[PDB]
Design a protein around this ligand. Structure first.
Ligand SMILES: *[C@@H]1O[C@H](CO)[C@@H](O[C@@H]2O[C@H](CO)[C@@H](O)[C@H](O)[C@H]2NC(C)=O)[C@H](O)[C@H]1NC(C)=O
Ligand SMILES: *[C@@H]1O[C@H](CO)[C@@H](O)[C@H](O)[C@H]1NC(C)=O
Ligand SMILES: *[C@@H]1[C@H](O)[C@@H](O)[C@H](O)[C@@H](CN[N+]#N)[C@H]1O
Length: 497
């Protein structure tokens, strides 16, 4: 293990400072002996995923908070956790010296870090790019004879994805999302603003756009990268808005439905990439369940849709049950997956707030709410940004768990990094959420899961200032007596036999 080198930037908590020769890292994962539990703790006061162990007690008495495991109450199985390899993320990472690059990638993807097993890949340019480009900018190239990956893919994104996959012990899943089509496929002839595909589903514009997906997957496959899934479009609602400032492609739910049924579904199904999953929506959960009903009550569309991708704007609030809950109830066999989450969105908020414990708590609160409402995965936005929260060609700056200081050959691991880690490191793919009931009203957020091997994991977040004594009951083993300190997050792990 190497501990956090803490640094204050004058906000509520510290960042952990990493450079070419030093980064905080875990010892190789270990199992707690039966009758004992493992605790990982992070606190505003400065603890960063610190490991301790205690006994599981056969007996318990008290009037104190009891969380009871309900291991026979089984919910969703987990796909995984990770973040986005944007042009901005890749340019920042590759601006560090090679040894520093390796420590940053190890922080995210290694068992010595937090075990990310998802990477979201933009299909060409987004706002977290330093120029606008698509893979097919030659006007009216319906055959896509001038389709090609620029340097952003071949020199920045692809080599970093190879290196991330080399460092991971878990199999990593790639998720691809487009922001814009070529401008000659669009009613407005521009990468941004209000505009959809020209013509009607089934026509040459719609078929060229579907074939563009296959050309993307073919080009990544020539670089020995295979995708788990694609989304039908990043934030299709954005391209319906007049003056939308960055790359978008407008679809109504009806247009997405007919595009999937007539073009994208059949085209992927007839390709060598037929095993790639398609996720619909990839947008705000306020659009649910209406968007899911429009698309999935048409069997010609539904037979191609594996899942519903959702976006979180953490600065803002929204109701989970009415959106994620009702959607699961209508379409229980169509997985919900959180594909994008960001903080620092509002006009009056600093883009990057180095050492913000509040933004850490926003991430962990959001992941717990998602896991409590059937969501199988949770994908951060940019893996790394600069201290301004860029680069970003429209100055749409936001925060990132890792901030790169190129002038210092340094990177800072924010509280958000550790809040994400409390989930990503300890909830492997195939983990199943199970029931967890409180004996009394309490200020804590918690969720329980069982690993594929039958072991238990519980995450407990305390967003209050008050220490909360509590016991976790598992009927198979006994009682974990513990305390949730104010402004803390804990992960608890134990074997059940
Ligand atoms: C990278 O960070 C490490 C850890 O903070 C720095 O190593 C420390 O260097 C100082 C000053 O030389 C010593 O007082 C400490 O004993 C070192 N700590 C450890 C844990 O080794 C290192 O100097 C930094 N590298 C650069 C180029 O700034
Ligand atoms: C399209 O690609 C071909 C073959 O690489 C090339 O000769 C041609 O000039 C390209 N056209 C444009 C407009 O780039
Ligand atoms: C999600 C969106 O797809 C992405 O382009 C954007 O940068 C973030 C944060 N800011 N904004 N707008 C999300 O919207």
């Amino acid at each position: 293990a190497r501990p956090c080198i803490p640094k204050s930037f004058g906000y509520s908590s510290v960042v952990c400072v990493c450079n070419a020769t030093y980064c905080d890292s875990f010892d190789p994962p270990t199992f707690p002996a039966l009758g004992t539990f493992s605790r990982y703790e992070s606190t505003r006061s400065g603890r960063r995923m610190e490991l301790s162990m205690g006994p599981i007690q056969a007996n318990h008495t008290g009037t104190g908070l009891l969380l009871t495991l309900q291991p026979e109450q089984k919910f969703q199985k987990v796909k995984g956790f990770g973040g986005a390899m944007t042009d901005a993320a890749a340019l920042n990472i590759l601006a560090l010296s090679p040894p520093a690059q390796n420590l940053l990638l190890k922080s995210y993807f290694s068992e010595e870090g937090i075990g990310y097993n998802i990477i979201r890949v933009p299909m060409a340019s987004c706002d977290f790019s330093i120029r606008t480009y698509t893979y097919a900018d030659t006007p009216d190239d319906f055959q896509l004879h001038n389709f090609s990956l620029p340097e952003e893919d071949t020199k920045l994104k692809i080599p970093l994805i190879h290196r991330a996959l080399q460092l991971a012990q878990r199999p990593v899943s790639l998720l691809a999302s487009p922001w814009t089509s070529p401008t000659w496929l669009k009613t407005n002839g521009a990468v941004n603003g209000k505009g959809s595909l020209k013509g009607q589903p089934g026509d040459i514009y719609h078929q060229t756009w579907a074939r563009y997906f296959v050309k993307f997957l073919d080009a990544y496959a020539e670089h020995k990268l295979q995708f788990w899934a694609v989304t039908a479009e990043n934030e299709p609602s954005a391209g319906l808005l007049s003056g939308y400032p960055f790359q978008c492609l407008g679809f109504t739910p009806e247009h997405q439905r007919d595009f999937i049924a007539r073009d994208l579904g059949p085209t992927l199904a007839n390709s060598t990439h037929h095993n790639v999953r398609l996720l619909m929506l990839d947008d705000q959960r306020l659009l649910l369940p209406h968007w899911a009903k429009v698309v999935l009550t048409d069997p010609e569309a539904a037979k191609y849709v594996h899942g519903i991708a959702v976006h979180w704007y953490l600065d803002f609030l929204a109701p989970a049950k009415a959106t994620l809950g009702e959607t699961h109830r209508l379409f229980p066999n169509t997985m919900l997956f959180a594909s994008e989450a960001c903080v620092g969105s509002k006009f009056w908020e600093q883009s990057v707030r180095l050492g913000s414990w509040d933004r850490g708590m926003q991430y962990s609160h959001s992941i717990i709410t998602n896991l409590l409402y059937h969501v199988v995965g949770w994908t951060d936005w940019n893996l790394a940004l600069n201290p301004e929260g860029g680069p970003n060609w429209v100055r749409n700056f936001v925060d990132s768990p890792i901030i790169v200081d190129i002038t210092k050959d340094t990177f800072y691991k924010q509280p958000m990094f550790y809040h994400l880690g409390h989930f990503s490191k300890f909830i492997p793919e195939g983990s199943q959420r199970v029931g967890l009931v409180a004996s009394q009203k309490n200020d804590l957020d918690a969720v329980a899961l069982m690993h594929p091997d039958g072991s238990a994991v519980v995450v407990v977040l305390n967003r209050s200032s008050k220490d909360v004594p509590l016991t976790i009951k598992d009927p198979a083993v006994g009682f974990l007596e513990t305390i949730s300190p104010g402004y803390s997050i804990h992960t608890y792990l134990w074997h059940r036999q």
